[PDB]
Design a protein around this ligand. Structure first.
Ligand SMILES: [Zn+2]
Ligand SMILES: [Zn+2]
Ligand SMILES: [Zn+2]
Lengths: 454, 454, 454
């Protein structure tokens, strides 16, 4: 069995048992994490990856803590770029966890890993079998499995190519579903994992998941130096997994939304596939295989299967007091989606839809988080309405009705789409890019401390 | 017994037991595939084919992975054209799966298949008894059974003739029902297999199965370089089986909708039959028999028996913002169809029809997927209405009412058919073509790696 | 007991036990065949014929596969004209089934049948005791029983005379009821066997059993080269038994609707009887007796006893978009017929009649297939109406009311009959013709195959 640190009466345990049928998932709650689900998923994700891959294979852990990786029989070789403030504490914790294992293991190469840390604290740029201080672009070790566990700040094709040229033929990416960022939403939620993310421009909104505003009477309106008149989603996004905050860029998030087939054509050439192997309510495990030489052709399309509904709607909020409208995305449980089918046959108001959603939810054992019921309600009310206007404005079969621009071009009226509702068992198809061909860090007071611990 | 990787409480298990009464189907879920049904069908399809065919026969596998085929007592000879990015990984996986079997089998010719891969990585163009790197038109092996398991990108008559000239007298094609492509629909669904397909022109539709659109206010309408005024189904189609995406061409799909009898008359002559041996909710197993010399005659008709209802309707969507109408097809469960019979005796609105369909579905144990209930509802409402207009516009028995074109020709008013509903136990009859008479790939870094694995 | 390949909970098993009281009918489903009923009838029909006929008799099998006939103790002599594409595969299958029986039988003349195929592939025109490559007109064997199992493409009097001059005194014809073709219907259904047939002119109808149409907006009406103005039933008809398609001609179908007595008087003379020995819901077994010399006289009448109701109505459809009306026939279960008796005492609308039929059917255990419920409903509503107009227009007893054509002839108004309803336990009486007096195929590449298999 596999023990997950979630409450025994948790409703996420069934979702987590479906996503992992090959395991016996048992709750062993030992810590009141506010993002316990996001970790109960990744623990099982590594448990599954370690079964799929060959035991005699060497694994590379990009941006991962070496502390969690030991006590495992797999030949891990963690690569620690030390790009953030957690890596020095991660290395301190690794050195400290090795000390309590000097003799009480004699099964997990502890006596080799102590030597491996002291030998890399002797020479920093060195390449040891199970530890190094390089970036994933800088490491010189040769393996055949790579694992990107919660690694979003990396450009996908560049890093994948740099792993492939080192002999990596299999790669696993455990992370959040990058689909809300291909639809290019402003703010969004992963409610089953207590995760909220927002574009920095709307961090002062009133009521979205990740926001914080102030009280006011609305009588100033004079402090605009330069007009915006344009509130598109910029590049910087902030994620809050429970209470843990991470900054990301939309570019490096969208880069991991890889197509089914792509080509990495640098000094060497590889043809690569990307398969979503696990998917639970917004948290995915993707499998990339890379093989030498160009084979086949690439369509440049990426598919997302929706097991649970996916909404993206236009919501009206007040960012920093100013009433704007932007796009918010969320995941709705497939049960709620299936039970709204009959009501969305007509035009329902957001009040009626919210009362019906609260009924379906409470029927204290909630199916979906309630902070998303208002917006979802509004989303449904818009969708059901835009479905009636499609029915009243029936066109002719196979014809269009373009209008001349009066010089040489044609014009067609665009309709206003306020909601994109991807029901369960539908798919999203996004045109992405394939055919990619365009591919220190530690102090002395720390280097003295990491080997003093051993 | 035969073990299928679907969960024990699945409702597809009963449908899968009906399609295979000669087996006892046991659920053995070990993986949360989002297209587990489409594979639980094909596993049993190969189990059935291997019983029907003679054990002393040689089998050819067009476009199939050699990995899955071993551990079978049948004399397989897989032909691997390496036409896509999966065949290199398929060969890597085959070479890796052979290594774990060097000695632990001594029953499935593992020690012969290792040498058989070594002999083809020594000479590429060689023809070995159980493996080759050719296409189906290029392979030179002589067998008597061919199997096309999920092989849609091949022209049926050409490939079948090239198998027949090599002594193949029996062929099996396991695939999706090619009937939605003879009615020439724009988009469609196989909802029991979580499969959606769409013509590339409508991949930016709002709400069909395989689509993805954006939010907008509909106030630009100026970017048409050249008018379309014509939205007929073009040749390129994209399939999403769960989350696995494949591109297909309507020509090569319609190619496999073979008639009951046809003739392959090239340098040699064969008379051939095509029998649908298995069909489950949109997934068929066809049996082609080929015999030397022309016998009988061909009427050129292809029949599809509908066990579950088949709808094709005109839906109004907004592709990339533009409100168009195109044809969508889907499969409706025979129970839903039978329970809709009484309501379709009059004119029902799509709202009433959708509420009634939701009632019949929920009566949490859904009979049909709900994302298809709206369109189906609309379809029914149109059909029930076009059935009343046939009754109000009663004609005379055996006469027509053509009108002179005023020169020498006659004119008859055509009526608008918005829905084609093929109820359970009806049949589709399509005029197709019979009488056919008009019939490398591997790199060095991979050929080095395949034999290093063994 | 006799084992039929139908599901254990099938509702056709009761009807099949009534049609064969002398047998123990046991369901042994081993194949998901879409026309399992049509074969569960014929298997029992041959079981019955083999009991009725004398064991020391020689049997002739017209157009039958020799493969199914062996393993039977009866002295069969199959005649294989090789008129279609199934006979070459039938012979391949026979040669293959003999090979698996060379030694494991020593009870069914396997060692004699192998030599009998080798002797006929040595000389083609030869006449061997249990196999020949002739037609039924060309075979020179002398027997005393003939069996026509699903043989519709043969002219009945000519074939029967050619069998009689060879000493055949008993003949059996297992087939579909040829009564819908004596009423000369355009399309029709045998719904208990999943069989639909249509005249080729209406294969593009919208909603009948065997058809397939397209979507359209009805705005072309310009492509008629020559007017029809006349939609009578032509000679070519297509049958779909489940999904198996056969073409037949109305002439050779009506040929087997033989009268109770007829005379075959050519170079020799025979007086012949035709009795329907078995009848199940549209599938009959007819027994023809032929004796030398002319005896008695012939009324030239053929009778059909209706155990289940038989409808033929005028339905309005749209063939290829053009709204026409033609005649469709179907079989209604005697229970549905009996339970509609009280409603048809007045004028019921097709909507009310369809809701009532759906009530009686569902009262998921359907009595009749639902795709025939609308048309049947309409049929009933017409019949019940034409029965009221007979009652309101009461004539005088034994008189007519002809009107002079003003020259020398008389005229009577003909009434419009839109429905012919033959209730259960009624009979149809048709004036047919009696007194009849107007009465290679294999290549080398196959003849090399057939004895190579043995
Ligand atoms: Zn390293
Ligand atoms: Zn080969
Ligand atoms: Zn003969």
């Amino acid at each position: 069995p596999v023990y997950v640190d979630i409450d025994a009466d948790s409703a996420f345990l069934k979702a987590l048992q479906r996503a992992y049928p090959m395991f016996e998932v048992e709750p062993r709650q030992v810590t009141p994490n506010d993002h316990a689900n996001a970790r109960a998923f990744s623990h099982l994700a590594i448990k599954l990856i370690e079964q799929e891959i060959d035991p005699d294979s060497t694994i590379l852990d990009i941006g991962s803590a070496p502390a969690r990786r030991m006590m495992s029989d797999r030949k891990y070789h963690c690569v620690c770029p030390m790009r953030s403030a957690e890596d020095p504490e991660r290395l301190a914790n690794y050195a400290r966890k090795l000390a309590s294992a000097a003799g009480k293991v004699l099964d997990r190469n502890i006596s080799g890993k102590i030597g491996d840390l002291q030998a890399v604290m002797a020479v920093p740029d060195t390449e040891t079998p199970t530890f190094c201080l390089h970036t994933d672009v800088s490491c010189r070790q040769r393996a055949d499995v790579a694992i990107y566990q919660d690694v979003y700040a990396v450009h996908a094709p560049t890093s994948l190519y740099h792993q492939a040229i080192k002999g990596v033929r299999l790669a696993y990416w455990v992370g959040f579903d990058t689909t809300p960022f291909m639809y290019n939403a402003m703010a969004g939620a992963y409610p089953s994992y207590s995760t909220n993310w927002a574009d920095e421009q709307v961090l002062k909104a009133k009521n979205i998941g990740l926001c914080s505003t102030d009280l006011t009477e609305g009588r100033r309106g004079k402090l605009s130096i330069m007009r915006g008149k344009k509130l598109e989603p910029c590049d910087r996004v902030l994620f809050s997994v429970g209470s843990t905050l991470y900054p990301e860029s939309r570019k490096l998030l969208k880069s991991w939304h890889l197509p089914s087939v792509f080509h990495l054509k640098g000094k060497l050439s590889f043809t690569c596939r990307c398969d979503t192997v696990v998917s639970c309510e917004g948290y995915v495990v993707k499998r990339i295989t890379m093989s030498p030489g160009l084979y086949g052709k690439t369509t440049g399309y990426a598919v997302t299967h929706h097991a649970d509904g996916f909404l993206m709607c236009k919501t009206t909020d007040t960012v920093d007091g100013e009433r704007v409208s932007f796009s918010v995305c969320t995941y709705v449980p497939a049960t709620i989606c299936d039970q709204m089918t009959g009501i969305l046959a007509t035009e329902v108001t957001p009040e009626d839809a919210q009362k019906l959603l609260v009924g379906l939810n409470q029927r204290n054992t909630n199916t979906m988080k309630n902070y998303m019921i208002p917006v979802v309600a509004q989303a449904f009310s818009k969708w059901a309405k835009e479905c009636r206007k499609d029915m009243e404005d029936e066109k002719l079969l196979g014809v269009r009705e373009r209008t001349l621009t009066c010089c040489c071009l044609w014009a067609f009226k665009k309709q206003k789409t306020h909601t994109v509702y991807k029901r369960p068992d539908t798919q999203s198809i996004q045109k992405v890019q394939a055919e990619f061909d365009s591919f220190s860090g530690l102090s002395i007071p720390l280097r003295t401390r990491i080997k003093w611990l051993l």
